[PDB]
Structure formats: C-alpha cells, structure tokens
Amino acid sequence: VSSLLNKLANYTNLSQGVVEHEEDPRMGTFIGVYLPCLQNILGVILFLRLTWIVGVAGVLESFLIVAMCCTCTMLTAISMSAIATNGVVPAGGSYYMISRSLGPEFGGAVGLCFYLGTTFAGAMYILGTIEIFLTYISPGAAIFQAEAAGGEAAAMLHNMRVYGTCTLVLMALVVFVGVKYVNKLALVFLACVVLSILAIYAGVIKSAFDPPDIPVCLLGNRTLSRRSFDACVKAYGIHNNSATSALWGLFCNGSQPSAACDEYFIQNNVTEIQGIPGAASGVFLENLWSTYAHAGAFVEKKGVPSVPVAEESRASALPYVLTDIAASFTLLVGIYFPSVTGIMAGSNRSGDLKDAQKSIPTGTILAIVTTSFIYLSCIVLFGACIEGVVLRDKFGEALQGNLVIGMLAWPSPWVIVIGSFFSTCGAGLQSLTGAPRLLQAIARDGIVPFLQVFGHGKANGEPTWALLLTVLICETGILIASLDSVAPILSMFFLMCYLFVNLACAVQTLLRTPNWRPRFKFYHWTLSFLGMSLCLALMFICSWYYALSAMLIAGCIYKYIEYRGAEKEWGDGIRGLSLNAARYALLRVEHGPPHTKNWRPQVLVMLNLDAEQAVKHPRLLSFTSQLKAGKGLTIVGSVLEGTYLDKHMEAQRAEENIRSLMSTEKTKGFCQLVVSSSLRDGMSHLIQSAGLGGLKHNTVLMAWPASWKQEDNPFSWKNFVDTVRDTTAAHQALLVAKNVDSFPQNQERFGGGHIDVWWIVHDGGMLMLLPFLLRQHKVWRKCRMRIFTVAQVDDNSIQMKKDLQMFLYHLRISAEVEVVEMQSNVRRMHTAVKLNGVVLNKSQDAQLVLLNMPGPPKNRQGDENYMEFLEVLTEGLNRVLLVRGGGREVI
Amino acid sequence: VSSLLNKLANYTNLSQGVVEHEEDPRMGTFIGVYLPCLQNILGVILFLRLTWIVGVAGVLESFLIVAMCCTCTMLTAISMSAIATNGVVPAGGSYYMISRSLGPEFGGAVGLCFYLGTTFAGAMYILGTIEIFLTYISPGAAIFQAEAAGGEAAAMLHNMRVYGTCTLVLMALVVFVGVKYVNKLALVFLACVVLSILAIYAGVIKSAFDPPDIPVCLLGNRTLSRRSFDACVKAYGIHNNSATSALWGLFCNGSQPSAACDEYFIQNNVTEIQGIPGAASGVFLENLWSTYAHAGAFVEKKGVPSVPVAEESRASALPYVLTDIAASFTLLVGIYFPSVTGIMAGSNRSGDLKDAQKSIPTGTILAIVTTSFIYLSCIVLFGACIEGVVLRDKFGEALQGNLVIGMLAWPSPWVIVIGSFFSTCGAGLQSLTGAPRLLQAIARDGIVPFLQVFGHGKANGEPTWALLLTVLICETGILIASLDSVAPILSMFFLMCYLFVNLACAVQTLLRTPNWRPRFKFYHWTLSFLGMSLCLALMFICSWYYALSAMLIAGCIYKYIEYRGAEKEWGDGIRGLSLNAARYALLRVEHGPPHTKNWRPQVLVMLNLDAEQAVKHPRLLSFTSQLKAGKGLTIVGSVLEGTYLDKHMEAQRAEENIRSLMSTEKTKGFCQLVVSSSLRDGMSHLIQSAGLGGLKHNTVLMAWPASWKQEDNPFSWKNFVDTVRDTTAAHQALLVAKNVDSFPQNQERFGGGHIDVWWIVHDGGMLMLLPFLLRQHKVWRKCRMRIFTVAQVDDNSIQMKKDLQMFLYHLRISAEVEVVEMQSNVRRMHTAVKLNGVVLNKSQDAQLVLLNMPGPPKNRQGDENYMEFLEVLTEGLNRVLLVRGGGREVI
C-alpha cells in the first residue's frame, strides 16, 4: 500500500513536450501507458450522443459503425507498435517517437494534423460542457431566451457562442498561470469517468430485476414533451366537475372545453407507456432497424395506432418532440469517430518508462480492446433496455428534461450528470495544455520555419505564443456552436494523421529503408496497408470534401518541409531537392546483394585523349548509346597523364570536349576525367572507384590499340594487357571494339546485313544478349543473328537441339544455329590461324562479328604473345567486338 | 483547282499508328491539323442534348458550363503546344508525341486513359445513333413495345441493348474487313456536320424575319404530348351536333360527354401557343433562369394560369410531357463535357506535315476557338428563339415527335436528322478503328507487359486482338443503355489524361528536367498549373467517386510502369526502383551552376590504414557525424598502396572494417576504398573523382601526421603538404584535425567548456559557420563561442562594431568578440611563436580551438619550413582544427 501511494501521486495525463527531450521513479505498463490512453479515449460521445446513435441507426447499423471505427484505430496501434519497437524510443511525447523513425517530412505532416485535431477537440469539449449545463443542470440560467415558439433552434446557438467564448478565455487563463494545479487533478478526472461507467452497468443489472418507473407520454404515434405539464390525461374530475388538465391547455385554445382545439388532438387519445422497460422485456427485437428521418419530423412509435389528419401542421408551436437534424448513415459515422481517438496518449511518457519497447505496444492495444468492449456492450445494452422512442430523443425532452443515459443509472441520474460535467471540463483542460506543447516542439525542431516564433516559452519552458494561436483556432470551432458539426471536422484531422502513420510504415517495409527494423511480433506490412485503406474509406464516408481539404493541406505540408530542408542544406532549393532525392535513394541500395537475378550491362566507356586534347575515337560513344537505349548507367571516364597541380588548365579544356560529344551522341550519362601520374594508374582507379554506392559500373568498353609498334606507345600498349587483368580481378565484363572508326553513327541506318555470333565456350550468356540489345535500336533494327559454334564433341545434333531450346527460354529463336567442324607460342598462334580461316569463311562481309576473348597470361612475360594471338585471330574483318566476363547470371 | 483536288483526296481523319513509327505529299495547317481536330469535336451532344441543357439550366448557367469546359481544353491545348514544339515531333499519332517528351511513365498512363475514353466514346455514338433512329426516323420499328402505359421508360432500355449490340458487332466487322472504304468516307462525314451547322444558322436568320408555324398544346401550366391526336380543342361542331375531339377521348373515359372525365381536365382550358416565336419576340428574358425538377414532374409554362387540384395523379397514363431524369447543375456538366473532347485529333498526322512545330499549335488552338464560338452562339440563339417549354422537352414529344433543333433549321428538319445520323455512325466508326491502333502502339512499345499480345496485327499491320478487347469494353457501355449515364464515365477518362498532360508539363518546367525546352511563345508553367486545377475541379463536379476511381486506376498504371521498367533494367525491382530514382535525379543536376547561393560542408574524410588493416584514427568519423547531423553527403575514402592484382584480398578485409565503423558511428555515407600504386597518387584521385555528378564533395577532412621524423614516413609526411596544394587547386575547403585521438565520441557529452575561434584574416565566412554546426549536436550543445581577432589596424572599435553586426546578419550574436593586440624562415617562425604566446594566453583550457591555416609554399623546397610553422603555432593545445578554403559564399 506504501508502494501504491507514491505511484498514484506520480500519475499524470500529460505529454512530455520539448523540455524532456532537451535534457535527454520509472512507471509501469498500467500507470504509464494504460491509464493515460484509457482516459483520453472515454469521453463525451458516450454520455451525450451514444444513445441517440443507437436510436436513430438501430442496433445492427450502429454495431457496424463501432466495428469500423475501432478497427481503424486497432490497425493504427499496430503501426504505432512498430514505431515503438524500432530503435531506442526517444524521450518526450509521441511526436519525437514518430519523427525519428519516419523522418522529418512524415513527422511534421503528422504533427501538424495531430495539432489541428487536438485544437478542435478542445472546441468539442467546451461545447459539450455548455450543453450539459444549459440542458440538464440549470436550463433557466440562459441569456438568450426564445421570444416565441420557433426560436428554440436559433437562440440555443447564441447561448453556445456567448458561454463558449467566455469558457475558452477562462480555460486558457487557468492553463497559463495554474497548470501545476491542473496536473494534480489528473486522477480526479479519471475517477469521474470510471465511477460514471460503473453506475451505468449497475443500472443495467438492476433493470433486469426491477425496472424503474419512468412514464413517457404519447398521443397517437407522435411523442410530446413533458416540460410544461405533469399529468397525461385529457380531462379529470375535481370538485364535482369534469375539469381539464394542463395538457388540454397546450393544444386547445382556451381552458374551457367548448372553445377550440387542435384537429389531431381530438381524434386521438393519450397513451402512457413506460420509458425504460428493462432487459427483461423484449424491446431488443423492436429497436433493431434504422429510423432515419428529416429535420422537424415526429418521433413515433410503431405499435400504438393513430388516425391521419390532412389539416395543416406547424409542429413547432405545439408541445412535441421533433428531430433536430436530418440524420443519415454517413452523418452518424462522423459524429461517432471522435470517441475512439486517443491512440497517441499511450506514448506520452516515453522517457519515464522502464521498458518502453514493451510497455507502449502492450498498454495501447489493451486500451483499444477494453474501450471497444465498452462501446459494443453499451449498444447491446441500450437497445435491449430503453424503449426506442426515448433513444431518438436528444436533450431528454420526454423525460422531464433529464439525461437518457442518466435515467438508466442506478444510484442517481446525478452521478452521470456531475460525472460527465467534470470529465468534459477536464478533457478541455488537457486539450488546451497538450496542444500548445506539441506546436512548441514542432516550432523548436526547425523543420517548418515560418512557425519559428511559436517555440518561445517561459523560464520553465511553458508555451506563451503557442497558447494564443491555439485559443484563436479553438475559437473558430466554438463559432460553429454545435457538437454535431465540429465532430466531422475533428475526425478529419485524426484520420489524416492515422493515414500517414499507416502509409509510412508500409512503404518503409516494402522499399527496405535502412534503420527500419521493427522487432514487434504481430506486425506485417499488409496490416498497415489494410489500416491505410480503412482509414481512407472512413475518410470519404464522413465527408468527401473535408477529405480533399485534409489531403491537400497535409500534402502541401509534406512538400514544404522537403523544399525548406533541401534549401537549408544543398544550397539552392530546386537543385537541392534533386540532390536529397539521389542521396536518399542510394542509401537504400547500400545494404543488399550486388547481383540478384538478372544481368544488364552498365558500362564504363574508356576514352583516349591525344595532345591538343580531343577524343581519339568518337564512335565509341555512339556504340554505347545503341546498347543502352538511354536507360542505364553510363560513366564516360578518360585519363590524361601528369600532375593535377599544373595540368588542371588542360583538364578543364578536355572535359568540355567530352560534354560536347555526349550532347550530340545523346548519351545520358556521367563524365569522370582524371589527371593521373601515369596512364596505367588512372585507368586502374576508374575500374574500382567510378560511381558511388548502388550505381556502379558493370562492364568496361575499350578500343583496340591500333598502333602496335611505335616508339613511346610500348608503354601505352602494355597498359592494354594489364587492364584485362584488372577487370577480371574485379569480376567485371570487358568489351574490346576493333576498327571502331568504322562504326555506325546514330543517324546511319543499316539495311539488311547480319550480326554473326561465335559462341565457342565460356559465357554464351552475355554473348547472346549483346546483339539482342543492339537489335532494338534503329541502326541495327533490320539485321539477322547468325550464331555459330565449333565442335570438338563427337555429335553435333544434341549440340544444336539443346541450343535451339536455349532460345526457347530466351524468347529469341529468330537466330539460326550452325555448327562448323574440321613451344606454347607455336601451339597458340597455329590454333588462331586455323580458327581465322574458319571465321572469315562464314563472316567475310558481316556487319558485326562477336567473338570470345581468351584469358590473359599469368606469367606476365607473354603479353606480346597474347596480343599476337588476338591479331592473327582477327584479320580482315570490318567490325569486331571481343567479349568476356566473369561470374554473372543471365535469365 | 487542280491543286485543290488531290488535297481533298489526301484528307483522312485517322491517327498514324505504329506502322508510321516503324518506317520512320505533305499537308498544311488547314487540312492536316485543323479539319481533323474540328471533325472530332463537333459531335452528338450539339444535336441531341444541347437544347435540353439550355432549357433546364437556363441561358446564364449553361453559359457557365461551356465557359468552364472550353477553358479546360484551351489550357490543355497550350500544354500540348509545348510538347509539339519541344524536340523533333516524332512521326505517328499523339501517343508517340507525348511519350517521348514526358517519358514512358506519363506516356503510358495518358495512353491507357485515352484508350478507355475513346472506347466509351464509341459506346456513346452507337447509343446516339439508335436514339435518332427509334425516335425520329422510324419510331414504329421497335421490337419491345410497351404493353401498358407505364412501360415506356423500361421498354426503351431493351431496344437500346438489342439494337446497340447488333450495331456494335456489325460496326466491328466493317472495320475489320473494309477499313479502306471507311477512310475514303472521311470527307462525307465532315460534310454532314458542316451542312447541318449551316442549316441551323440559316434557320435562325430566317426566324427573325418570319417565324415558322409550330403549335404547342397547353392545358393549364402542364404541356401534353401531340403524338396521338391532332387538334387542340375540347369540343367542336360537326353535322349539327356539339361533337368532342380526340383530345377528349384521352382524358375522359368515354367519347360521350356525360360519362366521366379527369378532374384537372374539367377545371382548366386548352391553350395553343407558338413553339418557335423567333428572335424578334422577347423570349430571351423569359428562359434565362434555371428550372431543375425531379423525375416525373410536369413541363410547365410560367405565364399561363391554372387552378390546382388536390385529387390524386398518375401522370404516366394520361398524355403528358414528363421530365425523364432528375436534373442538377452537376449532372449537366457531365453530360456536356464529351462535346469539347478532341484536342488530341490535331496531332494525328505528325509524320505528314511539312512543319509540325508550327502546324500543331496553330491548328488545334484555332479549332478550340471556332467550336467554342459555335457552342456559345447556339446557347444565345436557342434561348432567344425557342420557347422554353419546348427546350425542356427531350425526344420532341410536343412537336409531333420531331427534333427540336431540327424544327429551327430552314430547308427541312430532315437536313439535321439525316445529317446527325450519318455523322454519328461515322464517329462510331472512327472510334472503333482509332482506339485499337492506340492499344497496339502501347502493346508493341513494351512498357506495360501483361498486354503484350494485343500488339499482334495482320500482314499490313491492322489490329486483330485489339479489336476484340475494344468491342468487349464498348459492350459494357451499351449495356448501360442510356446516353446520359455513359457520358460522365466518358468524361472521367478524358479529364484524367488532360490532368497528367498539364501536371507533367508544369513539373518538368519547375524541376528543370533536361531535354525539356519548349520554344512556344505563349507558354508559362502557371498556365498548365491552372489547367491542372480546373480539370481537377471539373472532375469532382461531375462525380466524386468516378474521380477517385480514375485517379486510383491511373495512379496504379503509373507505378506499375515504374516497377516493370526497373525490374527490366537494374536486375531486382525493389533495388532497381531506387537506382532509377537516383539516376534520374542526378541527370537534372548535371546542367546547373556548381554553387548558387549558400555554402554547407560536404565532406570527404580521409582515413589512414596501417598494416593489419584497421582504422588509425577512428574518432575522425565521430567528428564528421557532429558537423553533418545525418543530412549531407559524406564520402569515406581511404587508400592502401600496392597493385590491385594481388592486394584485392586485403582490400576486401579493409573495406569491411570501414563498414563496421560507419554503422557504429551513425555515419550515413559512402565508402570509396582505392588500391593505388603510391599513397600520394590515390589521395589525388579521391580529391578530383569521388562522387559522381551533382553529389560531389566540397571539403576534405584530414588528420595531422603525428610522427614527423621517422624512417619511411618522410615519403608519407611529404604527402601531407602536396595534398594541401591539391585542394587549393581544385577550389575545395580543407580541415586538419590535430590530436584527433582526444576527440569526443557521440555518447560523450560536454558540460560547459568553450569553443574558441581565431579569425585573423581570410575566410571568416566558413570559420564562424563550423562551430555553429557543431553546437547543434548534443555533444557540443552546452558550449560558448569566443571569437578573437588580432589587430594591426589602428582602431579596434570599428573592428568590433562591424563584427558584432556580422552576427546580426548571421543570427548568432551569442558569441562574444574580443580583440588582442601587442631570412624568411627567421621571419616566419618568429611570427608563429609570438602568435603562439597569444593563443595559449586566452585558450589554454578550451574544448576546441579553430585557426586559419596559411597557404602552402610555391617553391616546393620549403615544405619542411611550412610544417615547422604549423607545429610552433600549435603547441600545448588539446583540440585544434585548422581551417582554410577557396572561393565560396556564406549567406
């Protein structure tokens, strides 16, 4: 008990704002998470409007309203449970918990929609506590009284705007000077809720054994208000005379019987039924279907008979019970939905829990369950216990001006009326001390900068200019001055911030964002995708034009935070808004495997530059644009020798020549000019470090060194052999183009001609794919693939029939297959000239010949014999492309 | 005339499909662009439904409907004019013209919404030409006749579904076997439109001089149909007897007068007015306001008097004119909008124009003007010429079953009835030969692959399986079987593809996409933003749930083309969908200036590796994460010496050590490990080529070489001086950290302490910004900036007062300013030890000291005297950061 005393002194229903985030006993799941979440859910819709929803919509449709609204908040509490298990759970509120997991763009768009929903929540709680006062506590204490009979609907709006504005400016002064006394009353406001709920269930159990005696006065079908008179008779007997009652005086003109009366009043008789017959009676089968009506309609009972009258009716003057608002299904969804909001109250105390990754998912989910049980039990127990003609009666006009849910309670009706008065004034205090702390945390965070001032506070950190904005926004909801019109506006901001929490958790799971690994057990991305789809479907049931207003407000807060966050960082905004997009997309790719399922060439094309720096072989850019049809990566890297300290004047000239080609050749790519100490070295740096992160090259395209025997070129010729060794060590493909000056431009178009492929052995996967990619371009469009294979295996048939079903897997059987069959330096170059005689026998005049390229020698002294093997192999051919690669999958 | 004969033989209203794009006299603006665009605009709404819109909505609101719908298509024809002036104007249709400018994602989403809108356009034209046949040509030739009086609304739907299905399967057989004879009739279908428009304006001019004699038969206010009887009298006189007419037989029970009659028929008398009084009479002031009614209501006249009757009414049995559908404002917008669609018909002949960049913007804009003049002139001339009780009459029941717009025409009513019959059958043929060519072009384009088969054709290239899909989609619009319900579905797909054309042209202008430079004069991005906003506002006026269906269909076609286009290219789809995002964002940045307005450090941090490769100074990553708070670019580059051929085993070990730090240090960055021939060279390649494109580093962070005198390190020490020369030649900032082992980690937190800045001269812009960025991190959060300056200028006051207003511009006046005042190798190092005595006098125990760094020597023989100047300057300080840079703006 001594340990249970300082725990209840430690209880508070407040969000940890910005002062708990700058400085960054311990609570449990029950006091830290469960009780603050349950206090912010059970509110004013249960006591004022729930019996009216069960009456108008019936038991079946109002069971469907609660099943949809409690599922949108259950699937959102699973998305909040994924955020609460990811990472460290930073101290201070639910704003810092969301915005560190989902980033500042989703964090600020949720935070400003949760600020606007909390502000109009304080407007609904102030309009709710005036409605309890002026209807049930002291109805005579109203300034603007109706001067005539039809003034009741107009003069009640004037009492709401006068008393609501005077309550709001008084509520804000208590928060500004006495907020420490508001926080001590956090346990009193919980006890007013819990004792009111127990008084309802105590009255339902008592209503089965003996129902209470409440009479409801009927006349035909229609139901008449009990405010003026007391007795339900047309006439009685006093002092030996047939005297008329006070019900006679309201319909008939004079108190005397013979003068004048209403036409409907004469032909029908006054029936007196019981209002709360109990759970023993079978009224549950009666009030099970909907009774939607227009405004001003009567509140009728199905059983009692009446006779219709064609005489005219002004029902406002006579004492009747009339429907105030024209009700629908979509209207009752919008009025009910603020009764389930309060998910985010479970993570107000993220810095004061001993295990926040375990307390936050457990306490919020157990709070949605225990409140959805209360709303689903009350709908069954209001329909089965109250006559449905009393449930259709807002403002309790049939019950002498008493609260309908209060007459059901056992000890007194004053338990609920006092209990709903203090807990609604208390929820207005929490909505007006909790929403300025949220705006101050967003303002001091710096992500939205026009709102920077709202981050000023007092010496202890309490908001000053954030209160003044919140009172002015909450004043516009009091000027609407009805509880039923603020509630669809309120529901629209909570459904909007629940939409982004479910969207951002589903996108970051699919797109594999780094630092998003939620270790919560019952979480799957479809369960947030389904929560996004249901909280979007409820958002267009309520109002479709409130939904487009909320999606355009919150969508423009999202893009404004991107623009100012990139203007702050990468210099200019238009330029910076693409540099943050490229950085954030490359950090996602940083984790995965280098190759997954398919191969496609991503080429580093090497250019040679001469003195008076111009491109030596410009058609090597033309051939790159024919493989890559303006789609993939293309790094254009070239190397000039010398130190960077003195040759950076020539490096600015040579780079402008490369940009001149890539505009004309329509190469949509990148340029990496490097000034290296030797031309050998700088090609070995572009092989291993051209391109950062996910986008790195995959293939190296070169040109054949034509001048084989020269003076200074024997250093430059040897660089060709050692860069074959570099690409095979880095596991990269290599493409050598011979006679690259006689390659087609982009404007030349071949007619007829043939592309000959010679798959001997070793990586025919790439070697079929390269002419298939050329064939899609308009230069190589009308050509034919001939694919040739030499045979040293005995049979040629199963060579061919397996090869013809290689293209059945590859969908390119338009090619035709043919098989041709017939000390180291002696053995190598003799095999070349035998194979040379084979290849020009079938490919003398072809447009392009593809060949496998042999591996470079390992001893390094045979690099002149390896190059003579390649020259003898390729004699008298117009266009040769030599292909080799290492370790890749073509499917 | 001889030149005007082969031009009209060259005229055709067809889109150039895929066969004109594969092979890739000349027409002008008038025949090539203007006439095909005008033929596809003037259609069936002008003849069937325009007089009913003017009657129901009045002249003022229907002037507003045409002003909104012709502005959505005028602002879209300016966005199509920006596409037509960009680039080369590729041959073949409007699909290839849009998708080469806006990319394959916007191109395929527009193309499939323009395919679905063209298919339901063929369903409206077939339901339109059955309605002309069964109402005005032969009303007796109908299969399902109404068995009783109330069967007319139900049996007409059965005639639409039977005749519409038999027309659709017959229309598709003509296209499949005889499409060359359909294309020869393209000039006949234009002449049926133009001769019908001229017959209307010939009748309006004739109606001012003498109006025609058409009687309309009234009885009280309500208007009765003229189908059965002929004469508007209740009784007449024949063979010396008061005989009753045939109007008497339809209301009264028997032909005899005394038997029984209707109650409304007796008390009111039969009035006969003129139906088309002319432009001379002032009916224009009468039918100027709206008359929206419910279904089944009467068609009444304001002037004539009547007496009301309270007896019951079944108006369906008696001969009356009744409103068929309940009309609104939002209903008439959806019915009118298919009368303005046809912008895209101007660019059907992009391959057959002599100047396509000039013809396409001129001919489409002049076609929107000349049709918006026709619809705005007809509304004024229908209201001012036809009595409004005839305009509210669909199906011409008051006018003996004649067409209302046809009775206004001069030569005959049969000019319009025959003319609207052939041009509506002709628009159904063009909608059924033009929509399968569009689907075949999308299918053969390969951007959406589940639809690949639909690209098969005949030998000449005509679609086969694309016809069969189009008939099945057009069959579902005939099963709706009303002209007024297909038209909001039709309008929803055209407004959706006009929404993307206006959106994609506005985004690519703002975000500065490469290869988007439209050289059209009257184009601004706000004029496409305004066209996006109006074609979105019309899209929710028509139906809000048809609008959400079209935005979710077209939004999921957009993301499906992104996913399959990245799965095709970059291997895996999830991985590839981020690599296309990074490539496309870096090609936008490729064009602009390198620095625009502000500076922020984007750092290449250099790591040294020892033998048994581990990071020598791990806190140099910790200090980078405190400047960049997880926001900017961070390249982590390190160099190990040796050839890549043998040390790529150790390069895989050393790279895994770098990834171990960057996970723990929370560095969200990139790793560039380079194996170089010497450690001097590989640092000079990371300075100039680390990072591709827009995201390139800006600052180099190093560590001080502590071991100054060693054995092998005199080569490694000299690399420090020459990399100061490299960063100043590349115009990059440089940061040298001394005693980097004693730097704080991310978890250490300083309490108190001071950051001392010593701005002597030369780039105090960076030197104030560096401790301001550190101060925002939680390590350096509670510190103070002291900023010191030596003075060799005489006065210290205007030094300080200008310096204190340097921070008034920089918003960081929390710092305090203080001024301290008092053969080459003799002159250099004496100045160091004087300045050394100054700096430790004020900064002996500070947490971080910032200093300017002097320029490196030019002669290269003083690199040992430059390093001794830096060591004497920094004696006995715990944490020193030396700062220098070149050529940058800090605002």
Ligand SMILES: *[C@@H]1O[C@H](CO)[C@@H](O[C@@H]2O[C@H](CO)[C@@H](O)[C@H](O)[C@H]2NC(C)=O)[C@H](O)[C@H]1NC(C)=O
């Ligand atoms: C309304 O109720 C009364 C009794 O509650 C019905 O009965 C009549 O009461 C009058 C007394 O004023 C008697 O004179 C009649 O003989 C009663 N009629 C009976 C018993 O059939 C009265 O009929 C009801 N009014 C209706 C149905 O319009």
Ligand SMILES: *[C@@H]1O[C@H](CO)[C@@H](O[C@@H]2O[C@H](CO)[C@@H](O)[C@H](O)[C@H]2NC(C)=O)[C@H](O)[C@H]1NC(C)=O
């Ligand atoms: C109760 O009685 C009335 C007539 O005495 C029933 O009839 C309806 O009366 C309203 C007038 O307020 C009309 O608008 C409806 O059209 C009437 N409905 C009919 C004639 O079916 C009324 O339905 C009864 N209430 C019930 C049965 O709940």
Ligand SMILES: *[C@@H]1O[C@H](CO)[C@@H](O[C@@H]2O[C@H](CO)[C@@H](O)[C@H](O)[C@H]2NC(C)=O)[C@H](O)[C@H]1NC(C)=O
């Ligand atoms: C409808 O029109 C007639 C004349 O077109 C109105 O005039 C009456 O006609 C009858 C002939 O059947 C005469 O006996 C009456 O004397 C006429 N009344 C006059 C001239 O005032 C007739 O009144 C009209 N019906 C109405 C207004 O209900």
Ligand SMILES: *[C@@H]1O[C@H](CO)[C@@H](O[C@@H]2O[C@H](CO)[C@@H](O)[C@H](O)[C@H]2NC(C)=O)[C@H](O)[C@H]1NC(C)=O
């Ligand atoms: C023509 O006359 C009728 C009555 O003779 C006018 O009155 C309306 O009648 C309809 C019945 O179809 C009612 O629904 C309306 O409420 C009546 N309107 C009233 C009483 O104002 C009718 O308005 C007249 N038509 C006109 C003036 O265009």
Ligand SMILES: [Cl-]
């Ligand atoms: Cl509530």
Ligand SMILES: [Cl-]
């Ligand atoms: Cl909430």
Ligand SMILES: [Cl-]
């Ligand atoms: Cl049309």
Ligand SMILES: [Cl-]
């Ligand atoms: Cl169009």
Ligand SMILES: [K+]
């Ligand atoms: K609540």
Ligand SMILES: [K+]
């Ligand atoms: K049209």
